[PDB]
Design an enzyme around this catalytic site. Structure first.
Site, PDB file in Angstrom:
ATOM      1  N   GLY A  54      43.921  34.427  50.342  1.00 40.58           N
ATOM      2  CA  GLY A  54      42.488  34.216  50.197  1.00 40.58           C
ATOM      3  C   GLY A  54      42.029  33.822  48.811  1.00 40.58           C
ATOM      4  O   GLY A  54      41.581  32.693  48.586  1.00 40.58           O
ATOM      5  N   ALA A  55      42.138  34.756  47.874  1.00 41.37           N
ATOM      6  CA  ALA A  55      41.713  34.482  46.512  1.00 41.37           C
ATOM      7  C   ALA A  55      42.557  35.227  45.489  1.00 41.37           C
ATOM      8  O   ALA A  55      43.419  36.041  45.834  1.00 41.37           O
ATOM      9  CB  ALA A  55      40.235  34.815  46.329  1.00 41.37           C
ATOM     10  N   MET A  56      42.287  34.934  44.223  1.00 48.74           N
ATOM     11  CA  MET A  56      43.007  35.522  43.112  1.00 48.74           C
ATOM     12  C   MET A  56      42.050  35.746  41.941  1.00 48.74           C
ATOM     13  O   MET A  56      41.353  34.828  41.516  1.00 48.74           O
ATOM     14  CB  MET A  56      44.155  34.608  42.704  1.00 48.74           C
ATOM     15  N   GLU A  57      42.028  36.969  41.419  1.00 51.92           N
ATOM     16  CA  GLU A  57      41.037  37.356  40.416  1.00 51.92           C
ATOM     17  C   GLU A  57      41.435  37.056  38.973  1.00 51.92           C
ATOM     18  O   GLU A  57      41.081  37.802  38.067  1.00 51.92           O
ATOM     19  CB  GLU A  57      40.694  38.842  40.534  1.00 51.92           C
ATOM     20  N   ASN A  58      42.173  35.975  38.758  1.00 47.97           N
ATOM     21  CA  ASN A  58      42.535  35.577  37.403  1.00 47.97           C
ATOM     22  C   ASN A  58      41.334  35.715  36.476  1.00 47.97           C
ATOM     23  O   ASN A  58      40.251  35.203  36.762  1.00 47.97           O
ATOM     24  CB  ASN A  58      43.069  34.145  37.376  1.00 47.97           C
ATOM     25  N   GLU A  91      42.589  47.520  44.531  1.00 47.86           N
ATOM     26  CA  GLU A  91      42.095  46.729  45.648  1.00 47.86           C
ATOM     27  C   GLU A  91      41.120  47.514  46.514  1.00 47.86           C
ATOM     28  O   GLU A  91      40.088  46.989  46.924  1.00 47.86           O
ATOM     29  CB  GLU A  91      43.249  46.175  46.489  1.00 47.86           C
ATOM     30  N   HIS A 141      34.090  40.623  45.819  1.00 40.51           N
ATOM     31  CA  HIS A 141      35.345  41.341  45.635  1.00 40.51           C
ATOM     32  C   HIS A 141      36.073  40.875  44.387  1.00 40.51           C
ATOM     33  O   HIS A 141      36.607  41.678  43.632  1.00 40.51           O
ATOM     34  CB  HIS A 141      36.269  41.164  46.836  1.00 40.51           C
ATOM     35  N   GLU A 142      36.102  39.568  44.176  1.00 43.84           N
ATOM     36  CA  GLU A 142      36.911  39.008  43.104  1.00 43.84           C
ATOM     37  C   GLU A 142      36.261  39.149  41.729  1.00 43.84           C
ATOM     38  O   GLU A 142      36.940  39.430  40.740  1.00 43.84           O
ATOM     39  CB  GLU A 142      37.278  37.556  43.415  1.00 43.84           C
ATOM     40  N   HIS A 201      36.775  42.662  40.359  1.00 47.23           N
ATOM     41  CA  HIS A 201      38.028  42.874  39.638  1.00 47.23           C
ATOM     42  C   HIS A 201      37.924  42.505  38.163  1.00 47.23           C
ATOM     43  O   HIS A 201      38.759  42.919  37.362  1.00 47.23           O
ATOM     44  CB  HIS A 201      39.158  42.054  40.264  1.00 47.23           C
TER      45      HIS A 201
HETATM   46 ZN   LIG Z   1      41.404  42.287  45.023  1.00 42.99          ZN
END
Ligand SMILES: [Zn+2]
Ligand SMILES: *[C@@H]1O[C@H](CO)[C@@H](O[C@@H]2O[C@H](CO)[C@@H](O)[C@H](O)[C@H]2NC(C)=O)[C@H](O)[C@H]1NC(C)=O
Ligand SMILES: *[C@@H]1O[C@H](CO)[C@@H](O[C@@H]2O[C@H](CO)[C@@H](O)[C@H](O)[C@H]2NC(C)=O)[C@H](O)[C@H]1NC(C)=O
Ligand SMILES: *[C@@H]1O[C@H](CO)[C@@H](O)[C@H](O)[C@H]1NC(C)=O
Ligand SMILES: *[C@@H]1O[C@H](CO)[C@@H](O)[C@H](O)[C@H]1NC(C)=O
Ligand SMILES: *[C@@H]1O[C@H](CO)[C@@H](O)[C@H](O)[C@H]1NC(C)=O
Ligand SMILES: *[C@@H]1O[C@H](CO)[C@@H](O)[C@H](O)[C@H]1NC(C)=O
Ligand SMILES: *[C@@H]1O[C@H](CO)[C@@H](O)[C@H](O)[C@H]1NC(C)=O
Ligand SMILES: *[C@@H]1O[C@H](CO)[C@@H](O)[C@H](O)[C@H]1NC(C)=O
Ligand SMILES: *[C@@H]1O[C@H](CO)[C@@H](O)[C@H](O)[C@H]1NC(C)=O
Ligand SMILES: *[C@@H]1O[C@H](CO)[C@@H](O)[C@H](O)[C@H]1NC(C)=O
Ligand SMILES: *[C@@H]1O[C@H](CO)[C@@H](O)[C@H](O)[C@H]1NC(C)=O
EC number: 3.4.11.2
Lengths: 901, 146
Positions: free
Chosen positions: A285-289, A344, A321-322, A325
């Site tokens: 889905g996604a990545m919180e870089n 998470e 959500h992202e 983080h």
């Molecule tokens: Zn997450």
């Protein structure tokens, strides 16, 4: 392996710590010799000693170097020992440096290394993503160092603890745009040689922990706003996607959310800018870089001219959500992957919080219950389950790290943490939350550190109070699997608590400190008035006059299901709650109206209440107009509508559901002005969706009417679709069922013409709804032709045909006829998602014989990739056979009775 | 012969309609209605002359679920705007009012009563928007019909 040397054990030794990295790398976006994509790089890692040893160990994965292997220089002061050999361990992905001599504390040393690796398309580390735009193959360079996979980009200390600072540079094609965690230092400068290349240097990052690193060379563009505080917000998508306000929504709400979290954390956003990029394929889905967060396109972009409201929620709640983080996870990072559940799980809870602030009118907050709480409860209620807290010593291999991403360490995590924030009265939770952040900003932590800071806050206050310590209460929930079923005998006031499995007869073996008892926070309501509050102590039985009633009086526990537990009552209170629900149902909060349905069915499954009881908990729906209670009924009911849907009971059942829905259909028909203007409230829209879907699939005339009339209108003038995306799924999957080949062939035409994945998916499923046998079998044929249907979507299509009661035997025969050809050719295929979804209905001794056969027949050519999917399909049948022989007569009579008028 | 000043309040209603699920012509509440421009920009108009006449200029467009209105009302969809007698003790419909102040407004804010602008379809009158009127009764400013 033979561990005795610090390079045969999976963890980095505590000898040396990284201070900062200088990292330059260069992606070649055009195939090379043999047609191979490559990236080149060169790192200058600067570590610090903490305890003397003659060996240096950094992580390195799938990287070639310059046939010494690394240069070592002492920052002025330092004395530099010399390098003996320089090995490479391809298992415990280390680059091992052997030294002649030794090195001592205090003195920092610098390690220079230049290298290059495969810029493959494995969506991992430094990688390439090919995407089709127009009809050209475009190719960009992106990162995905999640868990590990930073080593797959450059030699470094790749553990989330060893935070460091990073100087990043990208040498890239002259006209492409370089992106990373931090803003570009200056403007991009022409490379010395090959002036068709530019150099983009980035400002030094804060102290992060690799794995949050991101760099992207692409042909992308952006839409941007600047929030009244200096921070720059930018939404990056493909140039076309940017043209139409596809990324507009994902910008509209990014600001507000970013503010909310700043306040909710009592911490300012720790970076200069916030880029969110939309990649076309991107799996996870996604990545919180940090600073540059990657999303799959369907998740970040929104087309108001081809997307459903459903699509809007997905965007808001994933940005939430992202961005969440960006503080909790990156600013204060958990020590090891064993505590991933907190990270998470937390963000999985605040999703709604942030989201809700962006769309105040939608009432997200609630959705956590069915979308997260009851969801995870289904898997946490079997002996197979596990507890959130797993000891660190038990997490080492990159594989073990990955298995830390269950639905438990996500949904349970969220539920647990939601309940925590709830019995400490929000405000207080935020106080500990904040003291936690400021305390550990830019450093590692365990989950105990948050438990502490929440105490530090409850201790400093006299207003609210708990039984035991915060950590004591939490341990009941974090240290042992499962959850309790709270039972209440309202006549006496007694109270029970018990480990809740739904398989009455189970070999629960996972031994538990605490003996599966919980300290349970129990809100309650008596006749709509909120009672005081109670706490179940880690004891089996108890009592209180909170849970006692008169002749006419009902109690009801776990308001808004803020408590990770299920409530069961005596057979009289239920009946009292039922009667309340019948008359003025506004009395019970909407999330509990859901709860009563969710719980009674799960109870009925566990044999704690009669199956008929859970059924009576649906009789109140004729006056219900809200998404959540209905959604509860459907979910729990659809197993019935699958065991009995080829049976004597589908008759009355189908009749009963028509009876319950009509008034709701009527309400929406009117409220929506003959289906011309969708409701505004997200949850109300969600209700209309289910309202119709149910009305149609159960044979309500006006609904079938609506669906037909609309579809007719569509073929009467294609290329101008009159059906609102909200309704398309249901309208299609009915018009087609209600008609012949005229419509099917049409839909099939629209399908092949369709270029947006949403529609395609709606059509493809609708096509499987035709009640024409020959059309289904024809469709089954098309299924194996990659020219017409995509092999990825093949298995999906097939058992989407098996969903059709008429297509059931069709698909079954097809599947078990074409099995050879399949394996023997198409053998990633998801061979298991198929066999499950096809045999999903088997619930007769005979159907078992057939299944048992298919196994024996196609035995000499095993199944693999699933096998336990076949054996386990054989399992679910036994269960079904038994459940039917028991439940049939009762269910039949119930549905028969409550259908009359 | 004394010279009077007469204003023609050209209020133009841009109707919007769409074909219902059952194929009926239902008038969308998203239809625009604009007033003669004054000092400000629209949203409010106050009759500042001796007398005035009200003329309603009706268009009409259609749209699908996409609420974008381009193609014009073919039919069963064709309709034209009418200003129904709303909650006011008077109407434009031919039949010589006299006020001391008369203002038309889109905002319900600062209002007496309102008129109902409706789409006169074939066999149907559907209210779409409301026309708010701010009036103070007197004998200085007249209202000539037609
Ligand atoms: Zn997450
Ligand atoms: C339980 O959750 C419900 C929502 O399902 C809450 O109802 C809202 O309460 C908020 C404040 O928390 C109000 O601002 C809203 O007006 C309410 N929303 C709606 C749509 O009614 C309710 O607060 C919760 N109830 C309890 C007892 O905790
Ligand atoms: C109301 O007026 C607006 C224009 O001010 C119309 O909306 C625009 O219409 C054109 C086509 O006519 C579109 O290209 C624009 O994108 C629209 N802009 C907006 C803000 O949506 C609208 O169609 C009019 N409504 C009716 C019923 O005629
Ligand atoms: C990275 O750059 C900063 C200056 O912004 C510098 O202080 C730091 O030492 C650099 N790191 C390395 C490894 O050179
Ligand atoms: C790292 O890069 C910075 C500029 O980005 C430079 O000043 C410094 O010399 C570099 N450090 C090393 C160890 O080469
Ligand atoms: C790395 O070296 C291997 C030899 O094992 C060679 O086959 C391969 O081409 C190299 N990989 C890259 C990406 O240069
Ligand atoms: C991690 O954080 C601790 C404080 O809890 C700090 O003392 C330590 O230096 C940090 N360790 C690493 C490897 O960064
Ligand atoms: C951008 O530059 C490269 C060469 O530097 C060229 O091959 C590519 O076609 C250019 N892209 C566009 C959109 O013009
Ligand atoms: C976002 O907000 C702007 C005004 O702030 C609005 O015009 C636009 O329609 C909104 N975008 C979407 C996709 O709703
Ligand atoms: C955090 O918010 C509080 C008010 O709740 C304020 O007093 C404090 O200054 C804020 N801290 C920062 C760093 O902005
Ligand atoms: C029904 O109950 C609600 C509160 O639960 C109350 O607001 C409402 O007035 C009641 N309606 C009737 C008809 O009694
Ligand atoms: C909406 O549909 C119903 C049933 O077809 C009809 O009775 C009613 O007149 C319609 N409303 C309209 C045309 O505005």
């Amino acid at each position: 392996l033979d561990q005795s040397k610090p390079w045969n054990r999976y963890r980095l030794p505590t000898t040396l710590l990284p201070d900062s990295y200088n990292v330059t790398l260069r992606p070649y976006l055009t195939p090379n010799a043999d047609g191979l994509y490559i990236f080149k790089g060169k790192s200058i890692v600067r570590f610090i000693c903490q305890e003397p040893t003659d060996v240096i160990i950094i992580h390195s994965k799938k990287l070639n170097y310059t046939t010494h292997m690394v240069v070592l220089r002492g920052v002025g002061d330092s004395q530099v020992p010399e390098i003996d050999r320089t090995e490479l361990v391809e298992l415990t992905e280390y680059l091992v440096v052997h030294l002649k001599g030794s090195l001592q504390p205090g003195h920092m040393y610098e390690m220079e290394s230049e290298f290059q690796g495969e810029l493959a398309d494995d969506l991992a580390g430094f990688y390439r993503s090919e995407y089709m735009e127009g009809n050209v193959k475009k190719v960009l360079a992106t990162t995905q160092m999640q868990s590990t996979d930073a080593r797959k980009s450059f030699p470094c200390f790749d553990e989330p603890a060893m935070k460091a600072t990073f100087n990043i540079t990208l040498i890239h094609p002259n006209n492409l745009t370089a992106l990373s965690n931090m803003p570009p230092k200056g403007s991009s400068t022409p490379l010395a040689e090959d002036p068709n290349w530019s150099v983009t240097e980035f400002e030094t990052t804060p102290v992060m922990s690799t794995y949050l690193l991101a760099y992207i060379v692409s042909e992308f563009q952006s839409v941007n706003e600047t929030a009244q505080n200096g921070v720059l917000i930018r939404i990056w998508a493909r140039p076309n996607a940017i043209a139409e306000g596809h990324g507009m929504y994902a910008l509209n709400v990014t600001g507000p959310i970013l503010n909310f979290f700043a306040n909710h954390y009592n911490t300012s956003y720790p970076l200069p800018k916030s880029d969110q990029i939309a990649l076309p394929d991107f799996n996870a889905g996604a990545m919180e870089n940090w600073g540059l967060v990657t999303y799959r396109e369907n998740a970040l972009l929104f087309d108001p001219q081809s997307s459903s409201i459903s699509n809007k929620e997905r965007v808001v709640t994933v940005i939430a959500h992202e961005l969440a983080h960006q503080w909790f996870g990156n600013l204060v990072t958990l020590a090891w992957w064993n505590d991933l559940w907190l990270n998470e799980g937390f963000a999985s809870y605040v999703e709604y919080l942030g989201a809700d602030h962006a769309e105040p009118t939608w009432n997200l907050k609630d959705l956590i219950v069915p979308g997260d709480v009851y969801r995870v409860m289904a898997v946490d209620a079997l002996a197979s389950s596990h507890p959130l807290t797993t000891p660190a010593e038990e997490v080492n291999t990159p594989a073990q790290i990955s298995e830390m991403f269950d639905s438990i360490s996500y949904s349970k995590g969220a539920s647990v943490i939601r309940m925590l924030s709830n019995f400490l009265t929000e405000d207080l939770f935020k106080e500990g939350l904040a003291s936690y952040l400021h305390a550990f900003a830019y450093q590692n932590t365990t989950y105990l550190d948050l438990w502490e800071h929440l105490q530090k806050a409850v201790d400093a206050q006299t207003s609210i109070r708990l039984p035991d310590t915060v950590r004591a209460i939490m341990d009941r929930w974090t240290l042992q699997m499962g959850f309790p079923v709270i039972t209440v005998d309202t006549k006496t006031g007694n109270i029970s608590q018990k480990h809740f499995l739904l398989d009455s007869e189970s070999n629960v073996t996972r031994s538990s400190a605490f003996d599966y008892l919980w300290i349970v926070p129990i809100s309650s309501i008596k006749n709509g008035v909120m009672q005081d509050h109670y706490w179940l102590r880690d004891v089996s039985q108890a009592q209180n006059d909170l849970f006692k009633t008169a002749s006419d009086d009902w109690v009801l526990l776990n308001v808004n299901v803020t408590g990770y537990f299920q409530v069961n009552y005596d057979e009289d209170n239920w009946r009292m709650i039922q009667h309340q629900l019948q008359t003025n149902l506004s009395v019970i909060p909407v999330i509990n109206r859901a709860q009563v349905i969710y719980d009674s069915f799960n109870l009925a499954t566990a044999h704690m209440v009669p199956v008929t009881l859970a059924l009576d908990n649906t009789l109140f729906l004729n006056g219900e107009k809200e998404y959540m209670p209905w959604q509860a009924a459907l979910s729990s009911l659809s197993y019935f509508s699958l065991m009995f849907d080829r049976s004597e009971v589908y008759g009355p059942m189908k009749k009963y559901l028509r009876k319950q829905v009509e008034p709701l259909f009527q309400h929406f028909e009117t409220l929506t002005k003959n289906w011309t203007e969708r409701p505004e409230n997200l949850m109300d829209q969600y209700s209309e969706i289910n309202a119709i879907s149910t009305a149609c699939s159960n044979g309500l005339p006006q609904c079938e009417n609506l669906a037909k009339t609309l579809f007719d209108q569509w073929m009467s003038d294609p290329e101008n679709n009159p059906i609102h995306p909200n309704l398309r799924s249901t309208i299609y999957c009915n018009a087609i069922a209600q008609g012949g080949q005229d419509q099917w062939d049409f839909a099939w035409g629209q399908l092949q013409q369709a270029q947006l994945v949403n529609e395609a998916d709606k059509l493809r499923s609708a096509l499987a709804c035709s009640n024409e046998v020959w059309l289904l079998n024809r469709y089954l044929g098309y299924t194996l032709n990659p020219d017409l249907i995509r092999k990825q979507d093949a298995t999906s299509t097939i058992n989407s045909i098996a969903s059709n009661v008429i297509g059931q035997p069709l698909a079954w025969d097809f599947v078990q006829s074409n099995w050879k050809k399949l394996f023997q050719d198409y053998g990633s295929f998801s061979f298991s998602n198929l066999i499950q979804g096809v045999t999903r209905r088997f619930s007769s001794e005979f159907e078992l014989q057939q299944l048992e056969q298919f196994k024996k027949n196609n035995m000499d050519v095993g199944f693999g990739s699933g096998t336990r999917a076949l054996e386990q399909a054989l399992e679910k049948t036994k269960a079904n056979i038994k459940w039917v022989k028991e439940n049939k007569e009762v269910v039949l009579n119930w549905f028969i009775e409550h259908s009359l008028v | 012969p004394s010279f009077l000043t007469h204003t023609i309040v050209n209020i133009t209603i841009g109707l919007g309609m769409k074909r219902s699920g059952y194929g009926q012509p239902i008038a969308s509440t998203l239809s625009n209605i604009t007033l003669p421009m004054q000092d400000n920009n629209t949203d409010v108009y106050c009759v500042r002359s001796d007398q005035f006449s009200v003329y309603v200029h009706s268009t009409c467009k259609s749209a699908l679920w996409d609420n974008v209105f381009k193609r014009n009302c073919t039919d069963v969809l064709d309709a034209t705007a009418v200003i129904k007698t709303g909650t006011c003790p008077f109407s434009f419909d031919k039949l010589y009012l006299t006020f001391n102040k008369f203002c038309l407004s889109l905002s319900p804010v600062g209002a007496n009563c309102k008129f109902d602008v409706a789409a006169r379809t074939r066999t149907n009158d559907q209210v779409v928007r409301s026309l708010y009127v701010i009036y103070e009764e007197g004998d200085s400013i007249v209202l000539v019909p037609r």
